[PDB]
Amino acid sequence: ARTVVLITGCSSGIGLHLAVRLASDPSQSFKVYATLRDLKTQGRLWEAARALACPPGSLETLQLDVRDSKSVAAARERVTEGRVDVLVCNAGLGLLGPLEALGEDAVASVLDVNVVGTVRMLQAFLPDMKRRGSGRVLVTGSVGGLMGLPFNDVYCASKFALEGLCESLAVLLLPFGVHLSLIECGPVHTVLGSPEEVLDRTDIHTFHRFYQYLAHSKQVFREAAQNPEEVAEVFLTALRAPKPTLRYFTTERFLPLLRMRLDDPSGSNYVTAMHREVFGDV
Amino acid sequence: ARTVVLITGCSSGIGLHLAVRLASDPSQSFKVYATLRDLKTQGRLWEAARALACPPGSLETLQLDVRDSKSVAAARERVTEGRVDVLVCNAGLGLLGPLEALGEDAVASVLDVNVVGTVRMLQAFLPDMKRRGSGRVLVTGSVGGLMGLPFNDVYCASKFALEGLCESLAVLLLPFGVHLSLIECGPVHTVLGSPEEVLDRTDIHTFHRFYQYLAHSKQVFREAAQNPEEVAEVFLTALRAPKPTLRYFTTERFLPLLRMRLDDPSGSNYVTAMHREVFGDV
Ligand SMILES: C[C@]12CC[C@@H]3c4ccc(O)cc4CC[C@H]3[C@@H]1CC[C@@H]2O
Ligand SMILES: C[C@]12CC[C@@H]3c4ccc(O)cc4CC[C@H]3[C@@H]1CC[C@@H]2O
Secondary structure: OOEEEEEOOOOOHHHHHHHHHHHOOOOOOEEEEEEEOOHHHOHHHHHHHHHOOOOOOOEEEEEOOOOOHHHHHHHHHHOOOOOOOEEEEOOOOOOOOOHHHOOHHHHHHHHHHHHHHHHHHHHHHHHHHHHHOOEEEEEEEEHHHOOOOOOOHHHHHHHHHHHHHHHHHHHHHHHHOEEEEEEEEOOEOOOOOOHHHHHHHOOHHHHHHHHHHHHHHHHHHHHHOEOHHHHHHHHHHHHHOOOOOOEEEOOOOOHHHHHHHHHOOOOHHHHHHHHHHHOOOO | OOEEEEEOOOOOHHHHHHHHHHHOOOOOOEEEEEEEOOHHHOHHHHHHHHHOOOOOOOEEEEEOOOOOHHHHHHHHHHOOOOOOOEEEEOOOOOOOOOHHHOOHHHHHHHHHHHHHHHHHHHHHHHHHHHHHOOEEEEEEEEHHHOOOOOOOHHHHHHHHHHHHHHHHHHHHHHHHOEEEEEEEEOOEOOOOOOHHHHHHHOOHHHHHHHHHHHHHHHHHHHHHOEOHHHHHHHHHHHHHOOOOOOEEEOOOOOHHHHHHHHHOOOOHHHHHHHHHHHOOOO
């Protein structure tokens, strides 16, 4: 179809749902290049596509490893239409655990995939959009890019990094007609490490707090996780907005914590509120 | 002396000033390990130390490359007191230019030094502080970690990343008696790329906007840059606070732009205001 969409990280989760949502759109106006790091994981995407009866040719899979600029360049060459109307930077990795228990390689990988990988995509696709004077870039954000969460230090670092990157670009892009938007997701229905391993790399008190955090997050997920269909639709709302805003929120549930965070720049109200919220009183 | 301070990136700028400010303190209560990536750049630090008459033994230089965990481990071993009371994570790199004109290596380096290097330091020193139930960690922040600036995409990405990292850690650290604070700096009196090189890697319109930005920043610096002595003193105010806050601001000048940014979560007021502020009307 006519609007060419390229999405990264479509093997599961939001990327998978978004790819099939667009490819199966009743208007048949989207051509979707769903990219994955490893093609051997494409089965779920095709099963979903078949379930939604995506018309033949509305969806194509490409292997694209955001850690490698050559892979990024090669996938761009595979876009037969010679243009990308909507670029969805969704590829992302999580990392949970006490900071001192995280391997340096794992820390570097999260940043390389989440942040540098997004930079690689923008460097490869943005020039063309600037030239044409049109294009939409949607970036999967997280409420973790808006406020710090204990035991998610590196993940939050990476999501905050995207906020800074995108906001900086948005200020420049205004006159180019290229729109960039972050879709700020809360928990969505869709890694960890052996207790033994974690305990071996941290102290007993940190380990105890980790347990409390895990218990707390499990509850937040139960109460607040959204269906992927609801979240994917927010991407569509952003891509159809004639004048998209910088951020779209999939839920308003965290806006108050965000405001408290915003109203006390010293950060002490937020730190204290979040600490009592997750652990209790200290 | 008694309070052991370890500071990264002391070859120039804030780190250099802070190191000599602490080592020369009239109380003679600080022992400072000033670290540098390359010892051949230590001359300015020693000239400054001599000018301030730092008592012999109040300052020692160590080579510490934050990109290398072995180097981090080796510097930690050189701390003869066997403890670090105050850790100042200051090492930082800047990167200015149109995103598409930045080399992938330069982008990765900024993140590795600014973000992963800080993680390496925390992983190496935080466990000890948690064990003792005391310690202060000061991290050099920037107003660029609080709001996006055009042409500073990667730099802002890295400073925003520190905000997320530190805020996440602060929530956990509250009960450990380990204090973490970001010192949010505006311009301070203390890299770029050939016009030809930049033009070769971007379009003429982006290049034009880059010129406008450079003109604008030159003016902001002239009007708002603070003396390094004033900025270094903010670190001291934070390190002496009995109950330090998460953030200290060296200036209040940008607080309004920060508030506008905070009051419109969609980001459109900020993007528009910043765009007119730097370029004009579009
Ligand atoms: C950061 C996430 C959204 C915010 C969630 C949250 C939000 C608030 C809170 O008090 C705890 C948690 C735990 C899990 C978090 C989620 C894990 C993945 C998701 O992106
Ligand atoms: C980001 C910095 C502080 C904020 C400064 C600013 C702040 C506001 C603004 O409109 C423009 C600039 C240009 C230079 C920026 C500085 C460059 C180094 C410093 O950390």
